[PDB]
């Protein structure tokens, strides 16, 4: 192979590899644009080391302060049925709708797999809005908190259009930290400065900022309570408060063993009481640190009276349903509830306490947050251009390699040097005709025609010195052409001025009757099996020219009856009554039938079909001929059609030319 | 080989292909799905160095207090009867069963090798279970303590479905340190920082997370009795299993499968040697006067299924032999082969069926003296057959018959004489050819194989032709030419060949340019 | 190939090559003429460290500062309609004008993308301009400001010519902090001195030094923020610590930290105020009309060498000679409905047609008949020009020459003589015209010739016809030779019918139009029917070097007349 190869190649199957590279770039540029862009937002943090530091960014601890200051375990995604409907909407210009919600309480299936327990919040209005979990209908409305069916949900400020769902899922704390720590990032920017670059990515812009200034925050926070930590009396306290609750735990946990030694709606307010609880007291210590270092005013510490006072109300409804229950259920739930809130303020204290610990270790001083987080408004993914880029070049290296495994891999004839090569004469190359019609009658000026009458004009000088004016027409396998040419050839022989009679010797699907205009009875089955007389199974074409022989009736044993002397006796009749008697055959590499016939042909030539055959399979095809007898005088190439591999690898495509006056 | 070649091989052999990588594949599913998820706890410490505390941390001083806090010599395990019963029963949603111990003194046999007494619990109820060591039977329940047979045991909280049984080990207390130091990690995660991340591994998610948390104030209340080390991040599990990572196992197993698929395939193409093509037999100059190919339909195929395409292959082969059978001495036509079960009972039976069509009278001489069998498939009057004939106890008018849905008589082998060879040469088998070749047009024999016995070189001398029959894919090159050339030193002049068996193959239609097979030509109806 | 095939080959193109150069040339001169000059200013900072100096200049609290006091969130850009107008206004002298704009709040759309809004200001003279943000139209003057339609806007000092245009846009905080950024760069250039070098660049030579000397004195103050505020702490809880010998004691405290609190400079010294360098930094116009020149070349050789390795054509006589083909003349292309050998008798190609008849006088001897067929593989291929020219170099010679135009499909040599349409060979044979009513003279020429006459609808089945080689039985007798003129044979099969009837058979095949295998194919189609082509007539030759070093001829033959 050369360059002119590949180039011809590349021509022919060029319709492939546009196809391909256009599916290509088409699936790349829907992928870049219907992909969620994820921003970035990113703050410098000032310390006075920093791979310490480092790590305590990255912590749980600090983390999961930022996931309850702003309740990143409440998950809240737009409904969108398909896995692009997200994406189409944004360029639809459909901004996301986005509600607020402060308080979620799901009824925590915490199942097998499922410990993310979701709802479906569908917008009826800007004011109220529907609930499903599991088919199970609950109207809210903004303001009013919700308390039913075990499921609380308080959403403010619904930024929606009516008809919106929204997919809300309680995903557990350890969850919302791994979710924040995966997009998180700290840098040293000069791994010696004490400058930290805090990035932060993820889908909404404003959100990311807000969640990178809290996680500044709490930091900052923490090492100006270490200023403050030493003369503490917060050490002392807890010092002191954490035997005491533990006795009044150890108390409580003792009690239990005595009334020890599963009511569905018992049970399931216990949880929730104690989750009201565990919030309220850890909302204590939160009013505590934010009251110091912040003020009343500010808008952190209003929203803390309001959760509060939200709270509260949710205790208040569920203190209210405690009373409603039975006395055998109010007995367990009050000391399960001291247990339960026993050892989660326990837990808290020790927190407290390990937390205040780390505080005072703190070699920092004073902690400086010279840039606050502000989101970059281009988003960093998708990367559009690498992404188009590279649909473009992976669309070309596999159209590349598609052409190349199928040029590697076919075998079917290209040119007629192909079967010249062999010592194979091809005495004509018909091209496709894209034009039960004759070819030669219905478009005589055809470029098929003009390439048949070639070959009449080259058979008119084989087929002398012949022993008689019979051409057996054959081929290799089915459907490569015998019929079309043979007819097609009977036609323009038929134009000038001779009496040609065809033969249709197939007698397994000849379908020559059809071609021509029939009455099907006596073809020339009926003459083989004796039930015909010559002259009455020889029939005209209409826009012909020739007389011709249908097959007749399909009988059982075809190669038999051609083997039949009858056969001999109709050609040698025919010999005298026809200047050229032409004989379809059917494939030889399929029946045998045309090695019987080829014994009374004195010309017989073999169709080969362009790239359906093989060169070997028309040698082959010659050789069993021989073999039985009959000489093949040569090949006719039938079906090429115009291509640039073989003007290149070759010198000419073999086509031929088209020579009309246009008019 | 090429590129044609190679692909040829792979389409051929996509069955095996498939079904190999199919396996290896099906192999690493199922151990991708019952293999036991291990999930992983981590915690942060804070060391105010790091590189001394971590060898503190990973010492049997440190982790052998979590053992006695915890119990971790107090091995349980749910009882499953095979390799996979546990993977399966956690594919179908079964929650494992667990139940608490915090007591347990096993009799300690310490014999010659089990160093970790074991007995087995079965769970009756909520609150009783049973206890069976080595047979014998202990009524438990949970609460009241059992000290019975040398045995202390006390369950509390039997947390499962009655029926359920458990392994209850007593481990010695190196091991459980060893097992939770196997699985126990230490880093520093800057080198340099004094920042400690104590990882662990583990089946149990809640229990490594305790197990994490006990090391870690074990060694935090050891430290201070290097100052106030801190406990930054206590242990929490990552929900997500670490082991087994089933895309990189499942991608093993296809990437295996192939790469084993195509050595198998790559052996097989390198070791094959029998005939591809009738090209190969042409190389040699072999004449190959048909190749048959498989029919896929002691019936006789050129009469149960005229159509069928090893019938129209061999109605080819009645039109080569017409042009090669002429110029010959006689009108006898001997069918050999190389090996047996190569198809020359098949072919020259159905070849005689072809030309008894075309009004010919012809003789089908059954010569396989040792294993004949064409009078089975022609419907037989088993009596006075070849063999008595050549023994002097038959004579040639009443060993023909007829086959009933054929067309030419036939001569049966007789009785299997004992010496088949010996009979071929007696005077009478040339008398009953040159009589038969005067009431028939044409008189085929079956032969036994020529690299088998010498029979078909006896019989060879009175055939005018004589054509071998070569096996598709069971037959060599030079089988058939070390058959052709043992009927030549014998005076047996062989005419060609025919290729039997043929199948359609993706291979030789690229390795060569024709794949021998043949097309099918029928109107469909 | 060669040293030699590849020169040649150099020569050949040499206009591709030049034209494609230059293009790429030209392009790369007008992207650096037209590109915009970005200039740069640097100043000099010396530090004690200026590793965390470098993070704290490029912070959105210090460049934040500077967009804040030059208003940097205010962008005016010239109007020019096309993305060249900036670049040939330049070029022409104008100068850019730039007006001065110190209050501006537009009504901020904030849509979906469009969170930069703006607005479009045209001067109408030194005082007075107009404004139009959506086709609302608002008049203003300098001075005055304005609070119209929720537009407010303030300009002074319009510095251009009435009827510019000003597009005014008011991006966000962050986008003008990160414009400024992204052309800011800090650097050491020390890595141990306290020398932080910074560097601006972009389009105005003046606003960008303007700009460092705020990033630079923004740092200042801002360091001495951070210092003096300790200092200032120190005495500011010192004068709140003031309570006698320790009074006294800290009243020399109280002026010790009066005295350091006001010598804020230490750490960080500008050693350098911001002045921009008049050289442009970019475009580098040297580099980029280089690389336009080499990337034109390297194009130009790439697309020599595929157009050499795909061509298939021929190039010379002798490639039809290595396959055994005899070549009997090389018609170059005649440079000058006429007959070239009639119109300009002395023109290259005549006398080219003029070796072919002393060639084919040895040829043609010890034929069967007087009648030469000349056909060719492909339409176009100079055919009817060789034939029809030919048979007027015979005909000079006194000769009686019969030129047939048996191209009954597209046959105009009764177009090129001059023609009586009627009776052409098409009607003689079909029966409807007398051999002697078809010939027809040649006015300016010499020989008869007979037309194809109307177009038939079966031109090959009439050639077959008994009556075409009566004519030429009997046109044989009256005349010294018969040139035939038939299709292509690659084309139709006319000239296989037409050349079982002639004694001589030629092929005219087209210089690089036709390919050898294409005339090889020809020969072979006509020698199966019947027909020998005694050779080939190479038509159409070019002068190319290429052919002048791969063989040793270019085969185009010389120029031999006395000027006079
Ligand atoms: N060169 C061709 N151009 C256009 N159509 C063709 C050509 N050759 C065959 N065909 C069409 O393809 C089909 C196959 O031809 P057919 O004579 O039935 O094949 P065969 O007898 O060899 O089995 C026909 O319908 C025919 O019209
Ligand atoms: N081309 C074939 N197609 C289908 N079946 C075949 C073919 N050749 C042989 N067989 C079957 O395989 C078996 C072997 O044939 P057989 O005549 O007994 O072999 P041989 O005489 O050479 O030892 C037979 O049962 C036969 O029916
Ligand atoms: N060597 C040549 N020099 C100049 N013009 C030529 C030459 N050969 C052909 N032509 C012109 O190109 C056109 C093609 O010639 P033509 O005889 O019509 O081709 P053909 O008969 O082979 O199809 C004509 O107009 C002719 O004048
Ligand atoms: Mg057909
Ligand atoms: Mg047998
Ligand atoms: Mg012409």
Not at 36 to 42: G, H, L, N, R, S
Not at 385 to 401: A, E, H, N, P
Not at 551 to 568: S, Y
Request: with cysteine; hydrophobic share 40%.
């Amino acid at each position: 192979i050369d360059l002119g190869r590949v180039i011809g190649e590349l021509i022919d199957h060029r319709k492939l590899i546009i196809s391909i590279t256009s599916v290509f770039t088409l699936f790349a540029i829907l992928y870049a644009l219907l992909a969620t862009p994820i921003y970035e937002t990113d703050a410098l943090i000032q310390i006075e080391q920093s791979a310490p530091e480092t790590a305590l960014l990255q912590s749980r601890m600090i983390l999961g302060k930022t996931i309850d200051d702003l309740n990143l375990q409440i998950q809240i995604e737009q409904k969108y049925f398909p896995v692009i409907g997200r994406g189409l909407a944004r360029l639809m210009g459909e901004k996301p709708g986005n509600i607020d919600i402060t308080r979620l309480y799901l009824p925590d299936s915490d199942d097998i797999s499922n410990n993310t327990p979701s709802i479906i919040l569908t917008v009826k209005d800007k004011e109220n809005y529907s609930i499903n979990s599991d088919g199970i209908q609950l109207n809210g409305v903004v303001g009013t908190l919700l308390n039913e069916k075990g499921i609380s949900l308080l959403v403010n400020e619904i930024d929606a259009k009516p008809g919106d769902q929204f997919v809300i899922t309680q995903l557990p704390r350890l969850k919302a930290i791994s979710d924040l720590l995966k997009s998180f990032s700290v840098a040293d920017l000069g791994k010696d400065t004490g400058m930290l670059t805090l990035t932060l990515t993820g889908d909404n812009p404003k959100r990311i900022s807000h969640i990178l200034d809290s996680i500044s925050q709490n930091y900052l926070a923490q090492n100006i309570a270490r200023q403050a930590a030493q003369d503490a009396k917060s050490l002392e306290f807890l010092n002191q408060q954490l035997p005491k609750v533990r006795a009044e735990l150890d108390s409580a946990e003792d009690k239990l063993n005595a009334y020890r030694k599963l009511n569905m709606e018992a049970k399931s307010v216990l949880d929730q009481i104690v989750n009201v609880d565990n919030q309220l007291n850890e909302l204590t210590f939160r009013e505590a640190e934010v009251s110091q270092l912040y003020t009343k005013e500010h808008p952190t510490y209003k929203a803390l009276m309001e959760k509060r006072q939200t709270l509260q109300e949710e205790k208040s409804k569920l203190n209210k349903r405690v009373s409603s229950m039975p006395s055998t259920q109010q007995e367990v739930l009050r000391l399960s509830r001291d247990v339960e809130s026993g050892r989660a303020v326990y837990l808290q204290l020790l927190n407290r306490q390990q937390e205040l610990n780390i505080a005072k270790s703190s070699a920092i001083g004073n902690v400086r947050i010279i840039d606050n987080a502000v989101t970059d408004p281009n988003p960093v993914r998708p990367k559009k251009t690498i992404i188009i880029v590279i649909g473009v070049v992976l669309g070309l290296i596999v159209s590349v390699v598609l052409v190349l495994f199928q040029v590697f891999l076919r075998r079917g004839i290209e040119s007629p040097e192909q079967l010249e090569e062999i010592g194979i004469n091809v005495y004509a190359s018909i091209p496709i005709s894209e034009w039960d019609t004759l070819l030669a009658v219905g478009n005589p000026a055809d470029l098929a025609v003009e390439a048949i009458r070639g070959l009449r004009t080259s058979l008119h000088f084989a087929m002398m010195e012949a022993k008689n004016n019979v051409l057996m027409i054959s081929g290799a396998s089915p459907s490569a052409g015998m019929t079309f040419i043979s007819s097609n050839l009977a036609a323009t022989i038929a134009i000038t001025g001779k009496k040609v009679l065809f033969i249709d010797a197939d007698l397994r699907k000849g379908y020559a009757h059809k071609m021509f205009g029939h009455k099907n009875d006596k073809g020339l089955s009926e003459f083989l099996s004796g039930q015909a007389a010559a002259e009455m199974i020889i029939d005209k074409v209409e826009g012909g020219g020739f007389d011709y022989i249908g097959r007749g009736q399909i009988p059982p044993n075809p190669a038999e009856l051609l083997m039949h002397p009858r056969f001999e006796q109709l050609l040698n009749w025919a010999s005298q009554n026809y200047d050229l008697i032409i004989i379809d055959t059917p494939p030889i590499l399929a029946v045998t039938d045309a090695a019987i016939i080829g014994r009374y042909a004195g010309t017989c030539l073999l169709v080969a079909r362009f790239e359906k055959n093989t060169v070997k399979e028309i040698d082959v095809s010659m050789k069993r001929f021989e073999q039985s007898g009959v000489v093949v005088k040569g090949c006719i190439l039938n079906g090429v059609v115009k291509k640039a591999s073989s003007y290149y690898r070759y010198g000419h495509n073999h086509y031929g030319y088209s020579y009309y006056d246009k008019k």
